[model samples]
Target: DCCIIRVSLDVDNGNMYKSILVTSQDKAPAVIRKAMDKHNLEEEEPEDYELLQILSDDRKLKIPENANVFYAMNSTANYDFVLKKRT
Candidate 1:
């Protein structure tokens, strides 16, 4: 199976952004849809939005059957950290 995940970053002094990860054989539309809905990313501004990176690894397989998760961080007033993974 395949998995898609979205991790968001929020800062106290700046807008928020997100990083997306697509794992497995192909892109999972349902995972993207769920992540978008979960984070309300559609309502955010494009400038404030970002796709930081995407990683692929067969040994690091993600199990979608597990619970979903979200991570938020404030690296600094001008920087943030966010990443996603499959369960």
Candidate 2:
């Protein structure tokens, strides 16, 4: 005899999109660091150079041309989510 298992789940999914224009002196790095720290990420000395590298490096950053950026706060920590537009 064989048994079958069926798992059913209802998850609400949608896209949150926005464009961010960082145009202030010494603002981009501070925002990124704050977000990373909020998520309990490894905190090193905050350097604008490192932040720019992380945002630009192809190997590290995978931002698409059309991506929805959003952030949410959970019980543990806050998280940033990016969603690519569906074709």
Candidate 3:
């Protein structure tokens, strides 16, 4: 059985999605893909950017695309996502 969690997820500098009903082990990219489709946007150039997990006081962690919600919750030690272009 999988654990279901509600996460009010974020997308960099934009407004976040409403509570997303995702199971614990679901991967990151799939949800982002569905979100792009729902918004009628092209899935372009994601490879040029990176995902960052932000915490209090400018602390951050880099996240991989293959990571899941459970991993993000437990592993990142932060509860946010930022779509940042590689600089």
Candidate 4:
């Protein structure tokens, strides 16, 4: 089975829900790449994108490159994953 997570672009408070399909071994790089593609953000390079694990207390974590996001998602108290462009 695959892991499903909600991915929101740029703005944290938006109605658009772009769900992503990630496997157990998928990392931040692959995760952001999928989100970027899903949101049709091809104009920006994947390297300039960052993935954040948002929490309920207005806190977010920048996921590590090689971290197993699928498994990590289930292990933490995260609100959702936010795909943000690195500025």
- Which candidate number has the best lDDT? 4
Model 4 steric clash pairs = none
TM-score of 4: 0.74
lDDT values, one for every candidate: 0.35, 0.27, 0.50, 0.68
lDDT of 1 by residue, 3-74 (tens): 333344332211334544544433333444434445665554333333332233222323232223232211
lDDT of 4 by residue, 8-72 (tens): 76644533477777776666677677777777775767678777777664566777577777655
Q: Which stretches of candidate 4 lie over 4 Å from their true place?
A: 11-16, 74-76
RMSD of each: 12.4, 18.0, 4.4, 2.5
Please report the TM-score between candidate 1 and the true structure.
0.27
Candidate ranking (TM-score, best to worst): 4, 3, 1, 2
Instruction: Tell me which residue pairs clash in candidate 3.
Output: none
lDDT for each residue of candidate 2 in 1-87, tens digit (9 for 90 to 100):
221111111122322222233322324345444333433333543342122112222332322222222211111321223221222
Worst 10 residues of 1 by lDDT: 72-81
- Encode model 3's per-residue lDDT on 3-82: one tens digit a residue: 33222234434434433455655576765543343433356455654445556447766566667756664433445545
* Model 2 score (lDDT): 0.27
| Cα shift from native, residue 16, model 3 (Å) | 5.4
